[PDB]
Amino acid sequence: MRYGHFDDEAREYVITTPHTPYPWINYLGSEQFFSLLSHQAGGYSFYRDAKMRRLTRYRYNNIPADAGGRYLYVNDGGDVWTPSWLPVKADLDHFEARHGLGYSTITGERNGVRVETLFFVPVGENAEVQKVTVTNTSDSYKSLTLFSFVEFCLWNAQDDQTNYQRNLSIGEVEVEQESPHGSAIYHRTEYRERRDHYAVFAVNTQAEGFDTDRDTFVGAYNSLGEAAVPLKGESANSVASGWYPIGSHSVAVSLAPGESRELVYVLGYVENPDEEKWADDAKQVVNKERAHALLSRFATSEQTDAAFAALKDYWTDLLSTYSVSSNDEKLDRMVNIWNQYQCMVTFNMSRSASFFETGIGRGMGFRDSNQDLLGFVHLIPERARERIIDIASTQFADGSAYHQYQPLTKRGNNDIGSGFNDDPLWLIAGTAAYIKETGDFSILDEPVPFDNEPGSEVPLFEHLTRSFEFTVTHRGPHGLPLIGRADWNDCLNLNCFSTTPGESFQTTENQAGGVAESTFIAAQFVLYGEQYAELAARRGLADVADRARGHVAEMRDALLTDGWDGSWFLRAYDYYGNPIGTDAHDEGKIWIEPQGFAVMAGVGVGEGPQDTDAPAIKALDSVNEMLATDHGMVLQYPAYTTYQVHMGEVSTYPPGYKENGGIFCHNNPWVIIAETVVGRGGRAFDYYKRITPAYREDISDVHRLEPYVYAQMIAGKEAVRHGEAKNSWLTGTAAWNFVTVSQYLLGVRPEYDGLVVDPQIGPDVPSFTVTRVARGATYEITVTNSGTDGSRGRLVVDGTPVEGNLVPYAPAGSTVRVDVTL
């Protein structure tokens, strides 16, 4: 069953019941200011840093989940309710929430009163803005008191929740009932201290009253759903002095039948230059100039409406780079709208804040930066370019890099340090793609430091060389790369050997040496080894290139021998050299990562889909028989039922969950592409459909999480909860699925010397057109598709039949028409 439906025209998902299987959130804000917003108005806002600069408080593991948010308590003749349904849970005659691009509306009607709220963060604005519309839809008169509600976080969220001995005493506000454009509350905790910023909560009309103390507003022994002030019908005008500060105003609205009222609220993040902090000599009153300026900017519905439409323009113009038209409206909505939206969010948010990720840790995987870039680089190339240079500057001079990178500080994480031997090659993956997309080889010439050390700068290409050579000099007895702490799979820790709860599986190493090898880094070395060879060759470094090709060929040999178990690739070699991922064993006979990434790199690919002796085909057939379920392909099988001390975290998970038999979506697109590579488009589109939001909307009660975005993890076949997802939104599944549907199924992928036009999607999408803007030009690609295994497209270019699958990059401002037949 479903709990809403897609509104393609509006570019929205519309949730028609407050009773979802789990809270479904949206992301607001696209620059420095962000918001988490559920269909019930829960979650929070933060500027830049979701740990140190969080404006509002949100409790993970609340009972019930999503119990606090931005609330507008309606008091209608004594009866108190909220349009978000929660916290109050009053019977609503109508409820609807619409999640769109950088905004959401929530609407509730009860007893002849309808409240619509537009939530969004404006462009060029560090503020969450609420446009409220109250409509008397009854035949009688209405006289209402509306109580707005926000609960503040004391900025640093880790502290706010763990350091009560200090922080129950530092809460401070200022109250400005007669604000230039209405009424406003200032949460200024620690502005007295080292903070040069405060928060503002305001409404563009004169408030009847207010409240900044949470215990006075809500009452003792009261849940948000029973708050005392709204039931009383009148604000308590509480002034906070420590404890829990809130933003709250009462607004009086009288309405004839059919008559409506519009109100605008702003949640703002205001900073001041250090010298400009105080309005007064005594340094007690905050300087509110900038806060008034922001509030002058949203004093009217007309202003607000314009900021909104502008936001709509931003996103409208942003998503013009790639779109498709098909028989299949689910594919269309994913390719054009929801998958691209999700990829921008992963860029803007990294892995900081989610209903699952708790926003306390500020870091993000070096490997995750790089994979994420592949999904948004067609949208924001100049930004992408700047990202590639940021992360590459933290790279150690020996080729390794920090396993985690801080986007806010643009520095590697020292505490975690290095050691994950797949991390380095990921920088090549990022560079190569960025350049194929833009043709900006100039970046390779850009100066980049090692470990952010001034005067150590070398051309970026030399960094790729460090990354390439790192694997060459760190191989094991079989010639496969040493795994180090882990490869892509963080829970594969072969140098951990831990028996002590609370030691870090990824960092702690209880045995010093060993020979642990990974087939996945091997496959990655062949794949991104050849991309590096391509870049060195074009660069004019022919000697370096042929030589790197030489290593790549060596790794290709190793995989197909020491890396091959007979019907699929081994996953790794352990500390003592015994194989991992072999049919000889009982559990973890087969792992998905090396099967997909290795065939992604042509290793084992024979003559065709018919070449069933081709290892790549044996592997892919093994992946189908042993790992693929209706819900996606599981990570390995069988899952580990007892703890394997030699293998780190992977076996600490119960069968069917996460890295132990979970369906890790991130790595499924690897098999999908591998399937287009070997020439089985139908099987590739099948797999892609099994894990894609649009196609899972029907089984929402199983999925639980948002039907519009990818989640990291869907419980595998050995979990009772199979089909159930966790960890939605922030995941490399987005980037890799976009790259899969856009470049391999649809078949439109940038190359250095032109645009490949190679569709591989199977019979289920017989016809489609792709519109893409590449190098200033627009290509219109009209595909007629039998979808037959091993059929590749013939291009007709601008009315003239051509040979091969590459289309030459036309000049900027050009329109090229490409006819493809499969």
Ligand X SMILES: OC[C@H]1O[C@@H](O)[C@H](O)[C@@H](O)[C@@H]1O
- Residues noted as catalytic: 490
726 binds, among ligand X, a second copy, none (CB under 5 to 8 A by kind): a second copy
Instruction: Strands of 66-203 (E only): list them.
Output: 71-76, 79-81, 94-100, 103-110, 113-120, 127-136, 142-155, 173-179, 182-187, 197-203
Residue 490 binds ligand X (CB under 6 A): yes
Residue 59 binds a second copy (CB under 8 A): yes
Residue 701 binds a second copy (CB under 8 A): no
Give the containing element (helix H, strand E) for 781.
Answer: strand 777-784
Q: Which residues in 653-672 contact a second copy (CB under 8 A)? A: 653-654, 657-658, 662
Instruction: Using the minimum distance from each CB to a second copy, give the nearer residue, 190 or 332.
Output: 190
Q: At CA 77, angle to CA 74 and CA 79, rounded to 5?
A: 55
Residue 297 binds a second copy (CB under 8 A): no
721 binds, among a second copy, ligand X, none (CB under 5 to 8 A by kind): a second copy
| Contact range with a second copy by CB under 8 A, out of 8-16, 203-211, 404-412, 500-508 | 500-508
Instruction: Using the minimum distance from each CB to a second copy, give the nearer residue, 57 or 772.
Output: 57
Give the containing element (helix H, strand E) for 306.
Answer: helix 301-318
| Contact range with a second copy by CB under 8 A, out of 416-424, 514-522, 647-655, 666-674 | 647-655
Q: Which residues in 341-380 contact a second copy (CB under 8 A)? A: 356-358, 360-361
Q: Which residues in 358-377 contact ligand X (CB under 6 A)? A: 365, 367-368
CA 335 – CA 642 distance, rounded (Å): 41
Residue 1 binds a second copy (CB under 8 A): no
490 binds, among a second copy, ligand X, none (CB under 5 to 8 A by kind): ligand X
CA 437 – CA 585 distance, rounded (Å): 44
Each residue 320-359 as x (binds ligand X by CB under 6 A) or -, in order, gives ----------------------------------------
**Nearest by Cα to 377 from 98, 736, 806:** 736
**Nearest by Cα to 622 from 578, 663, 571, 566:** 566
Angle, helices 732-740/668-678, rounded to nearest 10 degrees: 20
CA 603 – CA 286 distance, rounded (Å): 65
Residue 166 binds ligand X (CB under 6 A): yes
Q: To the nearest whole angstrom, how small is the minimum distance from the Cβ of residue 241 to a second copy?
A: 5
Instruction: Using the minimum distance from each CB to ligand X, give the nearer residue, 58 or 657.
Output: 657
**Nearest by Cα to 574 from 482, 657, 677:** 482
Q: Name the phi and psi angles at 747, rounded to 5.
A: 95, 15
CB 188 within 8 A of CB 172: yes
Residue 489 binds ligand X (CB under 6 A): yes
CA 268 – CA 607 distance, rounded (Å): 61
> Which tokens go with 59?
């409790």
Mention every residue, 6+ apart, whose C-beta is less than 8 A from residue 782.
767, 769, 817, 818, 819, 820
DSSP 420: B
Q: To the nearest whole angstrom, how small is the minimum distance from the Cβ of residue 666 to ligand X?
A: 6
For 540-557, give one letter per residue: b (16+ CB within 10 A) or e: ebeebbeebbebbebbbe
Q: To the nearest whole angstrom, how small is the minimum distance from the Cβ of residue 193 to a second copy?
A: 4
HSE on the CB side for 218, CA within 13 Å?
20
Residue 283 binds a second copy (CB under 8 A): yes
Cis peptide before 381 (omega within 30 of 0): no
241 binds, among ligand X, a second copy, none (CB under 5 to 8 A by kind): a second copy
* Range list of H helices, 668-772: 668-678, 681-690, 693-696, 700-703, 732-740
Alpha-carbon separation of residue 196 from 152, 242, 243, 269, 273 (angstroms): 17, 19, 22, 11, 7
Each residue 119-158 as x (binds a second copy by CB under 8 A) or -, in order, gives ------------------------------------xx--
Instruction: Using the minimum distance from each CB to ligand X, give the nearer residue, 648 or 679.
Output: 648
DSSP 335: I
CB 600 within 8 A of CB 527: yes
Residue 281 binds a second copy (CB under 8 A): no
Interface with ligand X (CB under 6 A), residue from 80, 472, 482, 491: 491
Q: Which residues in 156-185 contact a second copy (CB under 8 A)? A: 156, 161-166, 168-170, 172
- In terms of phi and psi (left: phi > 0; alpha: psi -120 to 50; beta: otherwise), the region of 417 is left
Residue 488 binds ligand X (CB under 6 A): yes
Q: Which residues in 509-528 contact a second copy (CB under 8 A)? A: none
Residue 151 binds ligand X (CB under 6 A): no
Count of residues that bind a second copy according to CB under 8 A: 74
Mention every residue, 6+ apart, whose C-beta is less than 8 A from residue 766.
327, 784, 785, 786, 787
Q: To the nearest whole angstrom, how small is the minimum distance from the Cβ of residue 481 to ligand X?
A: 16
Q: Which residues in 228-247 contact a second copy (CB under 8 A)? A: 239, 241-242, 244
367 binds, among a second copy, ligand X, none (CB under 5 to 8 A by kind): ligand X
Instruction: Using the minimum distance from each CB to a second copy, give the nearer residue, 502 or 799.
Output: 502
Q: To the nearest whole angstrom, how small is the minimum distance from the Cβ of residue 728 to a second copy?
A: 11
Each residue 613-652 as x (binds ligand X by CB under 6 A) or -, in order, gives ------------------------------------x---
Interface with a second copy (CB under 8 A), residue from 719, 761, 765, 774: 719
For 28-58, give one letter per residue: b (16+ CB within 10 A) or e: bbbebbbbbbbbbbbbbbbbbbbbbbbbbbb
For 125-137, give one letter per residue: b (16+ CB within 10 A) or e: bbbbbbbbbbbbb
Instruction: Using the minimum distance from each CB to a second copy, give the nearer residue, 500 or 800.
Output: 500
Residue 498 binds a second copy (CB under 8 A): yes
Interface with a second copy (CB under 8 A), residue from 329, 442, 643, 808: 643
Q: To the nearest whole angstrom, how small is the minimum distance from the Cβ of residue 169 to a second copy?
A: 4
* Binding-site ranges for ligand X (CB under 6 A): 166, 365, 367-368, 488-491, 649, 658-659
